[PDB]
Structure 1
Amino acid sequence: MDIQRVKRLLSITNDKHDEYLTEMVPLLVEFAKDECHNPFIDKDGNESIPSGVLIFVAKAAQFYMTNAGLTGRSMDTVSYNFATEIPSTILKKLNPYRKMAR
């Protein structure tokens, strides 16, 4: 997956996240391949990633920018409440491509 395409899908304009995305996006692609037991290879032997895997990879890369051991944070006038799990509607994007392990 192209890094600039993920930045367009998450509406990021600066380059503050480029070092993180360059590491995180190929790992999430390989995890979609291992979790679905599906190499995503078309008729002609070529890798062809479906659209739902792309939505899943972009949204999971956005989710994993948080801190893992933190639920809420407050700093004078600003405050944040964080999600603890990946939501089920993002995890259900991988559902139409699931095969069984052999």
Structure 2
Amino acid sequence: QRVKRLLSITNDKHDEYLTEMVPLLVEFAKDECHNPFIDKDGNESIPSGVLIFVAKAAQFYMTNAGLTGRSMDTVSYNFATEIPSTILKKLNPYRKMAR
């Protein structure tokens, strides 16, 4: 959309907020060696798995959030379509279906 719109989007609006949120889970969890997922500079990196979930969720969540941009009081539901059954289905979720 418009840059302003992008700014309006919460995720875009707060790079920091979005950026920060992932690593809390990420940083401890992954190996964690840590597989550094970080530069020496300390530029943050986001896990693939985390990224996929996060990006998908975040992208939806903003859409769900609206406002613009949000479902109408009487409207079709953005929620149903975007929210993964499918993406959840991605990663299985069970994964390697079996153990």
Task: Normalising by structure 1, report the TM-score.
Answer: 0.35
CA distance 1:34–1:97, shift in 2 (3 Å):
farther
In the alignment, which residue of structure 1 is the partner of 2:91? 94
Long gaps (5+) in structure 2: none
Between Structure 1 and Structure 2, how many residues are aligned?
99
> Matches of 1:49 and 1:69 in 2, distance apart?
25
In the alignment, which residue of structure 2 is the partner of 1:16? 13
CA distance 1:50–1:77, shift in 2 (3 Å):
closer
Long gaps (5+) in structure 1: none
> Matches of 1:97 and 1:44 in 2, distance apart?
36
> Matches of 1:99 and 1:42 in 2, distance apart?
32
Which digits, 9 at most, give the CA deviation of each residue in 1:5-42, with x for residues without a partner? 99999999995231331243235648997999999999
CA distance 1:91–1:39, shift in 2 (3 Å):
farther
Q: Which protein, 1 or 2, shows the higher relative CO under an 8 Å CA cutoff with sep ≥ 6?
A: 1
The structure in which a higher percent of residues are strand is 1
CA distance 1:10–1:94, shift in 2 (3 Å):
farther
How far did residue 59 of structure 1 move? 0.7
Task: Normalising by structure 2, report the TM-score.
Answer: 0.36
Q: Give identity over the alignment, percent.
A: 100
CA distance 1:88–1:67, shift in 2 (3 Å):
closer
